[PDB]
């Protein structure tokens, strides 16, 4: 399949080279998996979702998004017109108020929520949890990124946009699970975006067009962003029977396009994410 004329991180990801349009993937489009959404909540009924999102748990007084940002992050994993995983099932968990704040004790329960409600819920193919969120060290909240890693998801977590070492952020700094950088449209590293040996990945973060609240659309930019296409990207392969999702991240290192980006530290890998699409 193609989609002409798509956003730019999508091309990027179905391609060995910077600047094309299209974007190229296997019809499948990650049916069969689900990928967890874990920020400030999903408009579930935005029309790019077709029907294919759900709120099932909230921290706060509704399950609205009230802020925009799942919206945006939940539309790069699975929207229609915006998404890597066209056909995935999407469950959102608003840990972050509108604001998009929230305390650790809160980001915790939702990491262990997950774990337990994936076991009710029919996903054939594998499950993604992507965390487009941080703060500072907190062994904690390391703890419980890797207890749902472990638990049997592929967990996918930003690297932070403090241009600085990961090391110092949490979930970003527990190594078990995929921990993910920015780029930009010119295959730089993203100008905040975090680096550090905890880095796994890098994938597209600079001015991404994805869904917004509203039923509108808009273009932001953060190692947010470059998270889901990661998430989206391993659900589309774990449908294609390619990975699982304890080795996804490993897989898509491995079949990463690598040494093409540029300002990458020494210590930090220069690896892209890309889907090894063949017609
Ligand atoms: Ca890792």
Same mark, same amino acid.
């Given at each position: 399949?193609?989609?002409?004329?798509?956003?730019? *991180?999508?091309?990027?990801?179905?391609?060995?080279?910077?600047?094309?349009?299209?974007?190229?993937?296997?019809?499948? $489009?990650?049916?069969?998996?689900?990928?967890?959404?874990?920020?400030?909540?999903?408009?579930?009924?935005?029309?790019?979702?077709?029907?294919?999102? /759900?709120?099932?748990? @909230?921290?706060?007084?509704?399950?609205?998004?009230?802020? *925009?940002?799942? @919206?945006?992050?939940?539309?790069?994993?699975?929207? =229609?017109?915006?998404?890597?995983?066209?056909?995935?099932? +999407?469950?959102?968990?608003?840990? +972050?108020?509108?604001?998009?704040? *929230?305390?650790?004790?809160?980001?915790? $329960?939702?990491?262990?929520?997950?774990?337990?409600?994936?076991?009710? =819920?029919?996903?054939?193919?594998?499950?993604?949890?992507?965390?487009?969120? *941080?703060?500072?060290?907190?062994?904690?909240?390391?703890?419980?990124?890797?207890?749902? /890693?472990?638990?049997?998801?592929?967990?996918?977590?930003?690297?932070?946009?403090?241009?600085?070492?990961? =090391?110092?952020?949490?979930?970003?700094?527990?190594?078990?699970?995929?921990?993910?950088?920015?780029?930009? =449209?010119?295959?730089?590293?993203?100008?905040?975006?975090?680096?550090?040996?905890?880095?796994?990945?890098?994938?597209?973060?600079?001015?991404? +067009?994805?869904?917004?609240?509203?039923?509108? @659309?808009?273009?932001?930019?953060?190692?947010?962003?470059?998270?889901?296409?990661? $998430?989206?990207?391993?659900?589309?392969?774990?449908?294609?029977?390619?990975?699982?999702?304890?080795?996804?991240?490993?897989?898509?290192?491995? @079949?990463?396009?690598?040494?093409?980006?540029?300002?990458?530290?020494?210590?930090?890998?220069?690896?892209?994410?890309?889907?090894?699409?063949?017609?």
């Amino acid at each position: 399949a193609a989609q002409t004329n798509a956003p730019w *991180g999508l091309a990027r990801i179905s391609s060995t080279s910077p600047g094309t349009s299209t974007y190229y993937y296997d019809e499948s $489009a990650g049916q069969g998996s689900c990928v967890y959404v874990i920020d400030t909540g999903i408009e579930a009924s935005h029309p790019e979702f077709e029907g294919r999102a /759900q709120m099932v748990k @909230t921290y706060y007084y509704s399950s609205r998004d009230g802020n *925009g940002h799942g @919206t945006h992050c939940a539309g790069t994993v699975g929207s =229609r017109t915006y998404g890597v995983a066209k056909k995935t099932q +999407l469950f959102g968990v608003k840990v +972050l108020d509108d604001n998009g704040s *929230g305390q650790y004790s809160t980001i915790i $329960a939702g990491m262990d929520f997950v774990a337990s409600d994936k076991n009710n =819920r029919n996903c054939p193919k594998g499950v993604v949890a992507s965390l487009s969120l *941080g703060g500072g060290y907190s062994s904690s909240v390391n703890s419980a990124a890797a207890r749902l /890693q472990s638990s049997g998801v592929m967990v996918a977590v930003a690297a932070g946009n403090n241009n600085a070492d990961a =090391r110092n952020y949490s979930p970003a700094s527990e190594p078990s699970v995929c921990t993910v950088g920015a780029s930009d =449209r010119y295959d730089r590293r993203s100008s905040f975006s975090n680096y550090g040996s905890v880095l796994d990945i890098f994938g597209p973060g600079t001015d991404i +067009l994805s869904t917004w609240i509203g039923g509108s @659309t808009r273009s932001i930019s953060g190692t947010s962003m470059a998270t889901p296409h990661v $998430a989206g990207l391993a659900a589309y392969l774990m449908t294609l029977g390619k990975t699982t999702a304890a080795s996804a991240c490993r897989y898509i290192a491995d @079949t990463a396009n690598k040494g093409d980006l540029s300002n990458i530290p020494f210590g930090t890998v220069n690896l892209l994410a890309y889907n090894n699409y063949q017609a």
